[PDB]
């Protein structure tokens, strides 16, 4: 069963071309609409296809964002095309994406079930690549807002990571309201829980820290049932936020009772073998004040990732590391002098 459609290149010239695919299999449910796997007849390559319902009366936000993005650490929009069906009367937007075989969730769950933690070398590789993608999208003012282990795709052999699913992504601008009920509770920034409409891209950074901690711990650091229990889990570790911190999150909560609760030491949080720099990175990712959190680019330059900038560093399978040093001007636009650290001498010329 072979399907032939007229598709438009994702970031391309905007000249539609005929594309044929086959072997349609369901991968799972994306943010909005389900995700299929398929094989391009021409190349033989595997792709992911997220079919979403499109309303003819307005433009698709995800599509607008996706056509801007080209990055090694982000799942790329190969093509897009339209189709109809499902009671008809409407049109579906089909996003043809890179196919990637694995997720951090599946890998983390694979180690946790064996009562083990992911080797620090993978934690370094995966987190660094996530921060790069974050640094890239935030430079367009674009906030992913879905950051979580399930949306972190992996190639197990090459150890390449790719951020995926921008169905919740928004381009943020000063003076506009945004839904405070967003992300996923375990990875939801505290200001979001306070119902702050004014939040920035720093919320993705918070989520990243939650992922980092989870990979160190072996479980989500901030569990719990209600959205209000989420805040309880956070203060059980970070301690009751100061008045000045509440102000920086949601000013509408500045004066309130809020019983003082001692912060649980970061070193007592993780297992005794946990690297010091891993703990320092995590502590600078998770802060009540969003402005106090590291920028993704700053995170990349953190001492925790110094092992990746070693000329002799290799994967546990003997293969070379993926390209970590390939930063463009757009990636570095937030802090160009950081390249002095980010791009090691051995990768300069």
């Amino acid at each position: 069963k072979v399907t032939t459609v007229v598709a438009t290149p994702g970031q391309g010239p905007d000249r539609p071309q005929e594309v044929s695919y086959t072997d349609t299999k369901v991968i799972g449910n994306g943010s909005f609409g389900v995700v299929y796997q398929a094989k391009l007849c021409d190349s033989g390559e595997l792709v992911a296809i997220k079919k979403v319902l499109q309303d003819k009366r307005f433009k698709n936000r995800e599509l607008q964002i996706m056509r801007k993005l080209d990055h090694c650490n982000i799942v790329r929009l190969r093509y897009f095309f339209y189709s109809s069906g499902e009671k008809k009367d409407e049109v579906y937007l089909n996003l043809v994406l890179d196919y990637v075989p694995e997720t951090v969730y599946r890998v983390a769950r694979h180690y946790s079930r064996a009562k083990q933690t992911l080797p620090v070398i993978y934690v370094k590789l995966y987190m660094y690549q996530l921060f790069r993608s974050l640094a890239y999208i935030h430079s367009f003012g674009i906030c992913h807002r879905d950051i979580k282990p399930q949306n972190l795709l992996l190639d197990p052999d090459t150890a390449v990571l790719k951020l995926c699913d921008f169905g919740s992504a928004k381009q943020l601008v000063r003076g506009e309201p945004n839904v405070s009920y967003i992300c996923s509770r375990y990875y939801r920034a505290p200001e979001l829980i306070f119902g702050a409409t004014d939040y920035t891209s720093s919320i993705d950074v918070w989520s990243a820290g939650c992922v980092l901690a989870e990979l160190l711990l072996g479980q989500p650091i901030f569990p719990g049932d209600s959205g209000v229990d989420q805040l309880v889990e956070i203060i059980k570790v970070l301690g009751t936020p100061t008045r000045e911190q509440i102000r920086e999150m949601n000013p509408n909560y500045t004066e309130f009772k809020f019983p003082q609760i001692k912060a649980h030491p970061w070193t007592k949080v993780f297992r005794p073998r946990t690297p010091p720099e891993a703990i320092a990175l995590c502590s600078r990712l998770l802060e009540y004040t969003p402005t106090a959190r590291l920028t993704p680019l700053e995170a990349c330059a953190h001492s925790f990732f110094d092992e990746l900038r070693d000329p002799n560093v290799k994967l546990p399978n003997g293969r070379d590391t993926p390209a970590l040093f390939n930063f463009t001007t757009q990636e570095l636009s937030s802090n160009p002098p950081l390249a002095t650290i980010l791009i090691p001498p051995h990768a300069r010329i």
Binding site: L231, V232, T240, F258
Partner: peptide, 17 residues
């Protein structure tokens, strides 16, 4: 909303200590 939410939050902290 703000005073309402802070009241069910402050309660669950009296329960944690």
């Amino acid at each position: 909303e703000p005073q309402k939410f802070a009241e069910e939050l402050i309660h669950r902290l009296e329960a944690v200590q």
